[PDB]
Design a binder for this molecule. Structure first.
Ligand SMILES: [Mg+2]
Ligand SMILES: [Zn+2]
Ligand SMILES: [Zn+2]
Ligand SMILES: [Zn+2]
Lengths: 164, 307, 214, 112, 114, 168
């Protein structure tokens, strides 16, 4: 019964330490036993993942930012809900939340790569689709006896060609 | 025909250019393998059930790319903490009762701190990596770590054994920084997402340029990359044709090799008939294995002495 | 969840790939059996919550009527999945004795991880029975379903003799294929066998080709 | 483009294109021949869409068809009015005639 | 993080731990002088840095003629003369932030506004 | 035509103005820092794209102004030799000469050539070529032109021996 006494004593400590005092100490130990008996409903002290969810909820309570989690957990937000929530990112607090979504937006942008854009004109005509959406580009390859190549590519379909 | 094919493929190599290796040295490396690459790029298509899901694409890139501790390590400091069950550092004191709700250890604290952004960009929380560094030894390292939600993510570890601390702890620090894998598969590096399109048959019976999302990389492996979920195993493709040979088969190898040489010589100065290039590719592959045309490669064969 | 689920999924896909291998080698399996649902396999072959019991779902199989029509000699085949991470010499010894007692000629073995060479030395024992080993991660993906590999098909020795007397070759100038090729271990062929190969050509679409196992 | 239905309504030919085309409207045998070559063509379309995933039209190939029938037109001086003396039977047999008469490999056995 | 030296003899001090009183005592390996440590910090690797764009300033940077001149002012002395020049660090990822040094206020200031 | 010449001039001038605006935005440190590459690389990509758009817009304007009795226009749309790029190159502007994509590197300390003031990325500084052939050059543009030509000559004179070996 080591875990079912230790977590009950933990909730005794983290509910007596609140500025929200326990004169309804019987209500608060009812809340604690409800919390622990839904907490075991994932594991029943038979799975290694028991302590992880306990650490999540425990240090979310003892976080401060925020202390208002104590008030909302004593005035509502019932404990069998908060095994099945797994809302650790979602709670305590919302400024850290909006920080995380800015971080996720920044990472999703920065993981995108190179997108060289291939400026087009209507001067030539494609071979496949025969459209004047030529993604043209110009450069020199051969020896000194000639100018540039007149490289060609169509951007409407993907057709590369060359002009003589 | 082979002589005419040879002269035809030989003519446009004089009109060449010199990112990604192209031109003459790339052609020479491809034609003259050289179990060495210089460009370990491999192309990956997603599962077609995920068309344009960017969160799915970054979940996949996080699943595939290897990282280390040094990918997320910034602050790596060392401390002398005399009390084993009370911190001298005033910030880490609540984590003592977080992990405290097995004594014969040195009073020397190693301490690591990471980035929040460089932690959850790859979508890992600190609890399982503290679990990971716990389980990789479990015998010598008493390992303490915080919550995710703290302002500064911290690791507290000590050496446990029932003078001579600094250099041992420094070497163990260097070892855990240099060796411990986190997720992904090693010899694969940074990965980026292009918004490619693909000509796709229309449901009404036509063709349409439809977008899709792809994966490119700077590292090579084949034996693990089709294993991970959410991936098309079929349409994977790599420039590194020797690995395609080894994993798939020699017919797929000569197909991939012909595709690679066609891309390289069709980058400019295109084109030639397919039959010359196909003849070359298949005569270079028709011995049950790859064979570069060297002084040693094709020549050490049951071939006549005067050629 | 952690990697338990992807371990289950990898075992499911490996089971899939082995089933189509036994099918296209020419042994009578219902084609519907390979699209068995992942959750159905999970409910079918896990003990209590997350542990698959790899010793028991190993199964026997028989040649098709068309397989007997082409070739006169295939006995029944038998597959296995051990639970041991490396493979013990006594465990595989009991395996090969069971194969000999049940009178089978094709050894189909799957190892979790590496096997000692002291098991590998008595692998080519009891001829004419033949023994083969695969990795799950080597068979997580059905190699033929990759679009780059062409179709493969087996031959009779009669058809090989017909091919040689038609094209007037003698056995050696024909192009080879390595025994250690992945498609070679997929088809399980040995030396002296000829493989016809059809690939989607770009000037005639369908195109004959031939390989000899060496 | 290709659907012809000799007894149905919408894809029916105009009988001003053939003198022996008005009376054959509804014949079963000619309809069967047209339907089986139509099925041949649609299975060919499926085969080509399989063997090229993209859908490229222009391809390298032997002898041109467009210019050779163009000079056939401008040498034998076709007009714009006369229905041809052709029959559907003649066309559908002669295409298979030329089809077998293309001969690249002389030989007799099954493999050849 | 600095490397103290024994005041009796200018030699590199090493950390060594008290056996029972549990304090870091920087004892000299040359002589017998010993000193307690202010902090439990000993070693520090610092695998990531971003530093070096600024320094190398002499009191007469503007005495050299080759630096360009502009008309943005110093935001302490309001004099319109200045000397501007880019970063003194050169990595392949250093920024196009600029450094503006004046002669009147003799002060360094930048043009970033994030 | 002279009005078309001054249209070329103001087109290059507004290109320089937008380049100066982008450099000022960089120098005040607020930029996109485009995905994939580095901040400097995005800056280089921007200035290269702006100057190439300036060059070929100038060439398009010159070619569409050019007359129908122009004999070298008759030559080029007649085929054989020269091109639109040849005519534009000789008649309106050159564009920034370069070696291996990057423009002309910081050879000396802090600057390109010792003849400008320190720490500049202006189109004069790195040496985007302003003028056409016909009005002449400045010596800096002459030098950069010699740089790009010499690069072409050395790559040809090595690649001929390498391609001969691989062909044999
Ligand atoms: Mg010989
Ligand atoms: Zn096109
Ligand atoms: Zn001393
Ligand atoms: Zn001032």
């Amino acid at each position: 019964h080591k875990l079912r006494d230790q977590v009950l004593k933990a909730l005794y400590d983290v509910l007596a330490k609140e500025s929200e005092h326990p004169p309804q100490s019987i209500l608060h130990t009812a809340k604690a036993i409800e919390s622990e008996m839904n907490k075991v409903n994932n594991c029943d002290t038979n799975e290694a993942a028991y302590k992880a969810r306990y650490r999540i909820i425990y240090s979310n309570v003892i976080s401060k930012n925020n202390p208002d989690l104590k008030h909302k957990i004593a005035n509502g937000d019932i404990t069998p809900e908060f095994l099945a929530t797994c809302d650790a990112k979602d709670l305590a607090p919302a400024p850290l939340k909006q920080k995380i979504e800015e971080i996720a937006k920044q990472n999703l942008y920065n993981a995108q790569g190179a997108t060289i854009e291939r400026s087009v004109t209507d001067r030539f005509t494609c071979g496949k689709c025969k459209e004047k959406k030529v993604s043209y580009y110009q450069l020199q390859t051969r020896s000194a006896d000639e100018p540039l190549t007149t490289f060609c590519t169509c951007e409407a379909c993907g057709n590369r060609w060359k002009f003589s | 025909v082979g002589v005419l094919a040879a002269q035809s493929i030989g003519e446009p190599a004089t009109q060449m250019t010199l990112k990604v290796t192209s031109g003459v040295p790339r052609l020479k490396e491809i034609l003259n393998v050289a179990k060495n690459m210089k460009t370990p790029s491999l192309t990956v298509y997603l599962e077609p059930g995920h068309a344009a899901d960017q969160e799915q694409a970054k979940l996949i890139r996080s699943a595939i790319e290897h990282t280390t501790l040094k990918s997320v390590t910034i602050a790596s400091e060392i401390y002398y903490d005399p009390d084993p069950r009370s911190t001298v550092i005033p910030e880490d004191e609540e984590i003592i009762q977080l992990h405290f709700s097995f004594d014969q250890q040195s009073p020397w604290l190693l301490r690591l701190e990471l980035d929040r952004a460089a932690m959850n960009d790859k979508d890992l929380t600190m609890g399982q990596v503290g679990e990971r560094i716990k389980q990789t030894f479990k015998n010598d390292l008493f390992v303490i770590w915080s919550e995710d939600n703290d302002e500064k993510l911290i690791i507290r570890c000590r050496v446990v054994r029932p003078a001579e601390e600094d250099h041992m702890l420094k070497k163990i620090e260097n070892t855990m920084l240099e060796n411990i894998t986190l997720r992904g598969v090693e010899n694969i590096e940074r990965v980026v997402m292009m918004k490619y399109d693909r000509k796709v048959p229309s449901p009404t019976g036509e063709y349409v340029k439809e977008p899709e999302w792809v994966l490119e990389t700077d590292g090579v492996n084949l034996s693990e990359v089709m294993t991970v979920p959410g991936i098309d195993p079929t349409r994977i493709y790599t420039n590194s044709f020797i690995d395609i040979m080894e994993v798939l088969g020699i017919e797929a190898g000569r197909a991939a090799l012909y595709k690679e040489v066609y891309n390289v010589i069709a980058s400019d100065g295109s084109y030639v008939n397919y039959r010359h290039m196909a003849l070359l590719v298949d005569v270079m592959t028709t011995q049950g294995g790859l064979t570069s045309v060297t002084r040693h490669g094709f020549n050490r064969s049951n071939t006549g002495a005067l050629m | 969840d952690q990697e338990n689920e992807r371990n289950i999924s990898r075992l499911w896909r490996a089971f899939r790939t082995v089933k189509e291998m036994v099918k296209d080698r020419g042994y009578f399996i219902t084609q519907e059996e390979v699209e068995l649902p992942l959750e159905d396999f999970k409910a079918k072959y896990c003990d209590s919550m997350g542990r698959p019991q790899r010793k028991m779902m190993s199964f026997q199989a028989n040649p098709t009527e068309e397989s007997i029509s082409k070739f006169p000699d295939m006995g029944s085949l038998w597959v296995e999945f051990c639970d041991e991470p490396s493979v013990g010499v006594k465990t595989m010894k009991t395996f090969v004795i069971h194969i000999q007692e049940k009178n089978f000629q094709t050894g189909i073995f799957v190892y979790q991880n590496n096997i000692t060479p002291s098991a590998m030395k008595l692998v080519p024992s009891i001829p004419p029975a033949t023994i083969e080993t695969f990795n799950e991660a080597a068979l997580v993906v059905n190699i033929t379903h990759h679009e780059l590999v062409p179709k493969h098909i087996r031959l009779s020795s009669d058809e090989k003799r017909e091919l040689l007397k038609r094209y007037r070759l003698k056995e050696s100038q024909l192009p080879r294929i390595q025994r250690a090729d992945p498609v070679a271990l997929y088809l399980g062929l040995k030396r002296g066998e000829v493989v016809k190969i059809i690939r989607k050509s770009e000037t005639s679409g369908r195109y004959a080709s031939y390989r000899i196992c060496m | 483009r290709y659907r012809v239905d000799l007894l149905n309504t919408d894809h029916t030919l105009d009988p001003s294109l053939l003198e022996s085309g008005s009376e054959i409207l509804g014949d079963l045998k000619l309809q069967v021949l047209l339907d089986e070559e139509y099925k041949q063509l649609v299975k060919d379309r499926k085969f080509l869409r399989e063997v090229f995933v993209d859908g490229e039209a222009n391809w390298p190939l032997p002898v041109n068809i467009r210019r050779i029938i163009q000079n056939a037109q401008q040498t034998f001086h076709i007009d714009h009015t006369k229905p041809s003396d052709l029959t559907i039977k003649d066309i559908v047999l002669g295409v298979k005639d030329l089809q077998e008469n293309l001969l690249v490999l002389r030989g007799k056995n099954e493999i050849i | 993080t600095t490397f103290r030296f024994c005041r009796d003899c200018n030699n590199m001090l090493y950390p060594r731990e008290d056996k029972e009183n549990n304090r870091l005592l920087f004892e000299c390996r040359t002589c017998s002088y010993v000193e307690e440590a202010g902090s439990p910090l000993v070693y520090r690797h610092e695998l990531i840095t971003n530093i070096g764009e600024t320094a190398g300033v002499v009191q007469d940077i503007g005495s050299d003629p080759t630096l360009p001149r502009s008309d943005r002012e110093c935001p302490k002395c309001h004099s319109r003369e200045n000397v501007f020049f880019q970063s003194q660090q050169r990595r392949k990822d250093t920024s196009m932030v600029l450094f503006f040094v004046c002669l009147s206020c003799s002060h360094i200031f930048t043009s970033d506004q994030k | 035509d002279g009005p078309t010449m001054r249209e070329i001039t103001e087109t290059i001038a507004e290109a320089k103005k937008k380049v100066l605006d982008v450099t000022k935005e960089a120098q005040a440190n607020l930029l996109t820092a485009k995905h994939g590459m580095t901040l400097r690389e995005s800056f280089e990509d921007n200035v290269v794209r702006f100057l190439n758009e300036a060059r070929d817009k100038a060439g398009r304007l010159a070619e569409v102004n050019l007359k129908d009795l122009n004999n070298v226009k008759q030559m080029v749309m007649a085929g054989s030799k020269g091109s639109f790029i040849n005519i534009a190159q000789m008649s309106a502007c050159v564009g920034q000469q370069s070696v291996e994509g990057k423009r002309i590197a910081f050879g000396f300390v802090d600057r390109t050539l010792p003849h400008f003031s320190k720490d500049d990325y202006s189109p004069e500084s790195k040496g985007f070529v302003e003028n056409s052939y016909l009005r002449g050059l400045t010596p800096q543009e002459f030098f950069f032109h010699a740089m790009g030509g010499r690069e072409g000559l050395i790559d040809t004179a090595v690649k001929t021996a390498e391609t001969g070996y691989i062909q044999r």
